[PDB]
Amino acid sequence: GKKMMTTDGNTATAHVAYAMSEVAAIYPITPSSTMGEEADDWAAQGRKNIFGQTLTIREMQSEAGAAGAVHGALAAGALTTTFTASQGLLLMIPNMYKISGELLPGVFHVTARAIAAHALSIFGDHQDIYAARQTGFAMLASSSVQEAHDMALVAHLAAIESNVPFMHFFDGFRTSHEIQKIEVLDYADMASLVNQKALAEFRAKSMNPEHPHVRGTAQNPDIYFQGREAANPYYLKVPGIVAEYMQ
Amino acid sequence: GKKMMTTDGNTATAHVAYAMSEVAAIYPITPSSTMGEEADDWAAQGRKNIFGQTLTIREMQSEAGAAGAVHGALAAGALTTTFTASQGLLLMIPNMYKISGELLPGVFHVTARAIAAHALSIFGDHQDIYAARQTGFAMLASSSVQEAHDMALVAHLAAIESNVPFMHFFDGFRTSHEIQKIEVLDYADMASLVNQKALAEFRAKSMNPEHPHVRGTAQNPDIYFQGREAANPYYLKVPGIVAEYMQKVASLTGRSYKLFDYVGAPDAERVIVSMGSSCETIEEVINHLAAKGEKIGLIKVRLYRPFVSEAFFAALPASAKVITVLDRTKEPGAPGDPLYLDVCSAFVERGEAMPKILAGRYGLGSKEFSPAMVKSVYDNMSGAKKNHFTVGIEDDVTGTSLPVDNAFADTTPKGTIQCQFWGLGADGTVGANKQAIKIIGDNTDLFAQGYFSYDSKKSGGITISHLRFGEKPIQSTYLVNRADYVACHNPAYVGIYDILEGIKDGGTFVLNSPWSSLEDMDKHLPSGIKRTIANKKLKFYNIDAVKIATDVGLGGRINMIMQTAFFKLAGVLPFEKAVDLLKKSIHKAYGKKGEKIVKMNTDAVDQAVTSLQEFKYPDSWKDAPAETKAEPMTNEFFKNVVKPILTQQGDKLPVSAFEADGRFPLGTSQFEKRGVAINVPQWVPENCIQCNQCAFVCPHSAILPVLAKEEELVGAPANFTALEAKGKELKGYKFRIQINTLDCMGCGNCADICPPKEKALVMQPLDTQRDAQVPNLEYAARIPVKSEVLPRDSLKGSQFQEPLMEFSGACSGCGETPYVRVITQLFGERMFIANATGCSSIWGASAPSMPYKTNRLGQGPAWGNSLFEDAAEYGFGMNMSMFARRTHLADLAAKALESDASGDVKEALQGWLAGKNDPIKSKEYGDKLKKLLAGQKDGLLGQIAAMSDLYTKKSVWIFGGDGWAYDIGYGGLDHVLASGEDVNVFVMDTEVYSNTGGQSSKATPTGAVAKFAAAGKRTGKKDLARMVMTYGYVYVATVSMGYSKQQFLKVLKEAESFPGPSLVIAYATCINQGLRKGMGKSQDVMNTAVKSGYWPLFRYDPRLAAQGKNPFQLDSKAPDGSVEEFLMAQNRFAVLDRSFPEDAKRLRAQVAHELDVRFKELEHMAATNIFESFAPAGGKADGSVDFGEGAEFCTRDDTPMMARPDSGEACDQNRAGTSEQQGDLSKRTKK
Amino acid sequence: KNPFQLDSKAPDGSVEEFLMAQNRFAVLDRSFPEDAKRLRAQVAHELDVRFKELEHMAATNIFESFAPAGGKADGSVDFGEGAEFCTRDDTPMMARPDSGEACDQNRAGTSEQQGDLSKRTKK
Amino acid sequence: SEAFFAALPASAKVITVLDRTKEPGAPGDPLYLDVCSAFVERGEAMPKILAGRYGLGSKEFS
Amino acid sequence: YGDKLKKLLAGQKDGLLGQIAAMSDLYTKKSVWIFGGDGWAYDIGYGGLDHVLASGEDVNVFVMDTEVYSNTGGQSSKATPTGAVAKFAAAGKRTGKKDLARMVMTYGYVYVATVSMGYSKQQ
Ligand SMILES: Cc1ncc(C[n+]2csc(CCOP(=O)(O)OP(=O)(O)O)c2C)c(N)n1
Ligand SMILES: Cc1ncc(C[n+]2csc(CCOP(=O)(O)OP(=O)(O)O)c2C)c(N)n1
Ligand code: SF4
Ligand code: SF4
Ligand code: SF4
Ligand SMILES: [Ca+2]
Ligand SMILES: [Cl-]
Ligand SMILES: [Cl-]
Ligand SMILES: [Mg+2]
Ligand SMILES: [Mg+2]
């Protein structure tokens, strides 16, 4: 079903992120802090995600740490998400290359915020998200509180089916803190859109000593290039998948 | 003024960086490490910069720390520089925005290297520098060793005058490690080009309390945008500044450059736009093809940022009809790569002629970019005009690759001599080639080029040297493919590698082998080589280098002999002068000790010159009989992927041969069987006491204990000698220590510690053991491992378990691998491993060799390397997933208990729920559930059935070196241990950054010599163990296999079973430490490490505290006074004694003092009655509360940072005073 | 002399009031009294033990010396200089301008094992 | 690019690409560069393309 | 002496004395301070703080411990004590306060101290 509620971009997004994730490794940074805190509150109130479980949330020592933990959780077969922006997003860049390089369905929700240069600013612009455009993450933008809810859902669904990580972003403050009356979807409806076979395949290919594999090898000039191009088929399908889920 | 010099890109740019800098904040990372190390040597040697000062160099904990320090130094008015690459550069990005944002004249010298995505790569490409293109740094590229020097100078000069920081970059390895004879400027000349007025302004605007200012303010929407645009004028001027300095430097060097430079036909119709080393090869091809009438050209990009379209067009022929932009990177999903997008913008903004523009990708991770490939690119422009293509690979999955015709003719200038050398690691080939380059370059007018390809294998690895000499400049930035001279310094290569590939007709082929007679040669030399030598009329030379070396007294060392062969047969110099020059250098070099050493080498040359006679072969070789295929049985994957790669054919594997996510299967090292040991152990059953200590200690799992029953030895080979198994539980079994001679590395640790005075293990030549032991190992390998007879965690019993990490590429005698192998024998089947980058990730997972394997049930360590800095967090994430998913399983189990599931299922579910986090019980009941629910796909029972790989409690381990644990990953390690979660951290402390070249780490001890501690480290070893013990709830212990294997096993079980965080620090010997008597003494050194008191053993167990007992337990005894001999037995300490006896004495005494005080401290800890013994845990419940709920005063401020959905209620903001003060005021103003 | 000096005194027993006078502790007592009670008692235990440790540190006679700096000496030496066996591997990571010289790579056993084999073979 | 053009009116003669960022020294900001490449690859009509920067640090965009 | 040099070399613009004259803002020994909250010192900047202290150089670190990430909205840090309620510790933090002071004291060559204005301004 649908529900008419008045909230900001942060909460609209957290609403979806909570439902679609099993694990969340986080670190606070304005103006994305609200999402992680809302998530922690809901987990305490016993809110269940689409799997009927409360979200597993842990705070790290920094965003670099949060990104490493997100990478680990995904590698070990858990749907994972995080919330960040600006300086924090920059610290996640190294792991973003790894997350996309290993084709993991992670979803980063980012409140687009300025980068500290001649001065620091907690306000909105796309400096941070553009700084991560080469990481290999799909990037989906929402331009309103209502769109934040909708795109957040598309991002999770598309990440799961495509195996390509997604960065859903909306303007810091201008959208993250703007309050609007919008309609959200019940968690049951979100669950009905999940590609269950893709999800099961994600778990089957994950790290597990019962059926191990090696990831993160070191490669010489003889094969690195071919290995880097092997993921092309997946990126080629991303657009169609996003389009289909929007529908 | 100037001066010639043969060096590599790293050294060429460090030469400039040192002169132009006052401060350098650094961190090591391949392939830029050399720059920092050269700078440190020069500072110590007394080298001064342009200010007459020694460079102030400091090493940080990571590149993030280095960038921060660079920022601070610049802000404080000091000219600063740093050297980095790849992962390192990424960590500097945040500070780069600040450095450029504050208009500071910093200069970063970067060896462009690939970024770790599907896999890690230390090789060259532009993925890293493109990642920082939006930071605001000006970006200047050099395409050759000579250019690296010139551009480095321009960058420094331009940064100072423009106030915009620069990133000078050149290709990792392809330029950074390529050797060339070049010309460098004196420091005085560099100093004369500095803009003194700008420099003075830099000092005056810098941070200083006598004329302070505020920097790094926080700004609101009202002024931020304006502040960001205020630097526009500075960026508009940097291009002109760079152009002016290129001209000023040119007035001194004679080498001119422009922001964009064009080469080729002035009326070119097809043009390539490229950047970096590829430009040299492209220009070489253009000179060759243009001479044949082809209208082709190339635009070389020097200044990438800022990108000046005007300068780009100034270099573009108006006749160009097709242009292809080559990008050495890959940005998935982008409409095009960086350089291509910039060029496209130039044409759209110009709004005039619109040539056809194509985008091409090349050279990722140093992939070859040869003349043939360049030909493909030009041909594409006159043919199919494929866009967004790749070149250098066969993309049979998406078809984006251009076909490459390797029949393309050699394009090197006339007179160029090209040589290839196939050597075995440690045989001196590389060193000799480098000396040859120096000698020839210093005594002739010839340009010289050197490039070396190494092996991922650390010991007994193969090296291939590529050298070129010519009368014309050498622009061949690609491997030699058609050599005039080919030398094979290892006879073993003759049958496994295609050594004569591409050799020119009439070329010279020198071979090092004892096959002098024509019968022996025909016997060992393969038909393929015979035919090639015959058909190409090759001047074939064979020399028994080993025999000559031994005869002259050089103990069989062949380096001097093969050096003579090159100088006499290469054809680069007239024989007479060659031998003369060689001998002169033999006096230059060596000569150190008695004239004897000099004479031996002199005689070696003379004897060599005489023996170097053309081996005459029969014309019958024209068609020698091709042999068959004696290839043993192996995996489909090994024969189709790893073998081809191991035989240096990896480049021929198409994209379809790899997994999209980069994963590799476990156990591929099982079939390598390299056989590179010189000597291996021979078991002597008459003296064996069946203790299994030899198998326990092996760094490569080359010893297989065999416990078999009579019926199992029926078909056993005649020499499969077995003893009556000693022990009461082994009554009836036969025992045998089977040596795996082909996987053995010949270190000698096993034989060194074998208990009996009359050794049961004796080292013997590999050739005297292989014929008998190879079939024996195969037979033994088929005998079921008896893992149930003895306790899995007992010394002897652990070796009756399947080792799940074997035959890795670790050095012979490595001190890290024995520990890991044993850990897998205790928890292997259920462990996750988050491995930090370092030696353990290198011997652990260098493609295509995977040493980790599965047991007989297909279970094995799930291994992964994220980054160097995040190992703990990565592992913490794996633990989080398991917590979440197993909690989900438990939820379903509980639900199933309140359903109509059968009695048997409920019993098992109940049992599993009760033993959920118990390794034994979770498996016991999980296994019952796997049977009971087999085939179930419906409802609740179906979901539970699908989660079978979650039934048994898993063991999450985080493996890492001291560099990771004490330095770069310490912040994350600390947080993860502080979390209280169930993870196990195993630190292999080598007391230095081993894999990168032995740099000092905070784990390095006082007085130890290592890079950046070349006078002996002057700060003590960081006490990681004691710091972590301050938490009280983290299990902490130290181990040393050599001292006590029992204590080690005890620690492993205690640490792993602890229901919280565990940290185990192990003493790992390493070649960098320079063990005087050999790595085969590792166990003995580990033993002394503890006995001397240097490395005390102890355990800190929180569960003892929970039961009123002292958690700290000391496992070793007070120092026995042997520390002095312990230290002097290692070169890392001994070298200091030989070089600086005064300081060495004092430093070794300081060490003796440190361990004395530390042991006493540990003793007090073990006797204290002070420790926490409160509730283990419990609680949590359901619900939470906000910290501000019901507060009497405002709990949040009026800032946008604290604003939340529910904030905004009225509250007392503390502007009216205290509650009492307000009450009193109310009472006083009653009214 | 002992570097550690304690400037305050043993817990005076006012911690309970100290904690309850702050909402960050008091709010938990109102919402989860059971847990709050345990956690406040745990804090008191933690500080009791920590103060005792600090007292020990102040009474100890076990400690190292101290020297700000001094030495360095104009010069340096590579850790591999004069080593009996190779100190660097065959990897491109350890490759340096001056690397490449022959050395014993530990594939023939220890110094004594090698010397013994020579003796046992001679010929 | 195909989806971008599917949303572009054939009648468009002038196009302004607004980027909410600043990459010092770049020939243009990210979105502008992507759009330029789209037109270059199409090889057809080339309307005038303009680049504009706005909204840094929540600057009003009214 | 720096102040004497400022007077004696006033106007000096040429040669060696001119160079020394232009460096007067370097005459007096400066005091380098690093200011940060507990989140910085105990969490995100800890690895850096640890390394800088281990260096043995003359720097001064002053940590204002509010036992929470204050500016961002009161999130828990490793400096947050047992039982304190903060964001991500909404049921009372269940791990004790990290002992940064004792960890740094293990080096032996770093000066470490704790202060509390309300207890003693003199200390
Ligand atoms: C961010 C980053 N900086 C630097 C490096 C280079 N690097 C990789 S491993 C390593 C040293 C590892 O030392 P250690 O942790 O002691 O392990 P060892 O090789 O001694 O076993 C260095 C400097 C990197 N990969 N990533
Ligand atoms: C890389 C990065 N991550 C997160 C932030 C957001 N942030 C800025 S300050 C801060 C907390 C400050 O806490 P503390 O150090 O205790 O100081 P206090 O405000 O309490 O005095 C956080 C989470 C940031 N600016 N940069
Ligand atoms: S010599 Fe070394 S590698 Fe060989 S079996 Fe013995 S311990 Fe293992
Ligand atoms: S170490 Fe020696 S005595 Fe012990 S099992 Fe091995 S060969 Fe036998
Ligand atoms: S730790 Fe040392 S001995 Fe082991 S592989 Fe690394 S460099 Fe070699
Ligand atoms: Ca544990
Ligand atoms: Cl913030
Ligand atoms: Cl490296
Ligand atoms: Mg190490
Ligand atoms: Mg604080």
UniProtKB/Swiss-Prot annotation, chain B:
Site (Important for catalytic activity): T30, E63, R113, N995
Cofactor note: Binds 3 [4Fe-4S] clusters per subunit.
GO biological process: electron transport chain; response to oxidative stress
Annotated positions binding CoA: A426, D427, G428, T429, V430, K458, N559, N601
Region (Disordered): 1196-1231
Domain 4Fe-4S ferredoxin-type: from-to ranges: 679-708, 735-766
Binding positions (pyruvate): T30, R113
Cystine connections: C1194-C1211
Cofactor annotation: [4Fe-4S] cluster; thiamine diphosphate; Mg(2+)
InterPro entries reported for this sequence: 4Fe4S_Fe-S-bd (IPR017896), 4Fe4S_Fe_S_CS (IPR017900), PFOR_II (IPR033412), Pyruv_OxRed_insertion (IPR055168), Pyruvate:ferred/Flavod_OxRd (IPR050722), Pyrv-flavodox_OxR_EKR_sf (IPR037112), Pyrv-flavodox_OxRtase_EKR (IPR019456), Pyrv/ketoisovalerate_OxRed_cat (IPR019752)
Sites where the protein binds Mg(2+): D962, T990, V992
Reaction(s) this enzyme catalyzes, per UniProt: 2 oxidized [2Fe-2S]-[ferredoxin] + pyruvate + CoA = 2 reduced [2Fe-2S]-[ferredoxin] + acetyl-CoA + CO2 + H(+)
GO cellular component: cytoplasm
Record-listed [4Fe-4S] cluster 2 binding positions: C698, C744, C747, C750
Principal place of residence: cytoplasm
Residues the entry annotates as binding [4Fe-4S] cluster 3: C811, C814, C839, C1070
Gene Ontology MF term list: 4 iron, 4 sulfur cluster binding; iron ion binding; pyruvate synthase activity; thiamine pyrophosphate binding
Residues the entry annotates as binding thiamine diphosphate: E63, E816, C839, G961, D962, G963, W964, T990, E991, V992, Y993, S994, N995
Keywords: 4Fe-4S, Calcium, Cytoplasm, Disulfide bond, Electron transport, Iron, Iron-sulfur, Magnesium, Metal-binding, Oxidoreductase, Pyruvate, Thiamine pyrophosphate, Transport
The protein's role, per its UniProt record: Catalyzes the ferredoxin-dependent oxidative decarboxylation of pyruvate. Required for the transfer of electrons from pyruvate to ferredoxin. Ferredoxin I and ferredoxin II, which are single 4Fe-4S cluster ferredoxins are the most effective electron carriers of POR.
Known partners and oligomeric status: Homodimer.
Identification of the protein by name: Pyruvate:ferredoxin oxidoreductase
Organism: Desulfocurvibacter africanus (Desulfovibrio africanus)
Lineage summary: Bacteria, Pseudomonadati, Thermodesulfobacteriota, Desulfovibrionia, Desulfovibrionales
Gene encoding the protein: por
UniProtKB/Swiss-Prot annotation, chain D:
Localization terms from the record: Cytoplasm
Coiled coil: none
Similarity remark: Belongs to the pyruvate:ferredoxin/flavodoxin oxidoreductase family.
Quaternary structure, from the entry: Homodimer.
Function description: Catalyzes the ferredoxin-dependent oxidative decarboxylation of pyruvate. Required for the transfer of electrons from pyruvate to ferredoxin. Ferredoxin I and ferredoxin II, which are single 4Fe-4S cluster ferredoxins are the most effective electron carriers of POR.
Protein name: Pyruvate:ferredoxin oxidoreductase
Organism annotation: Desulfocurvibacter africanus
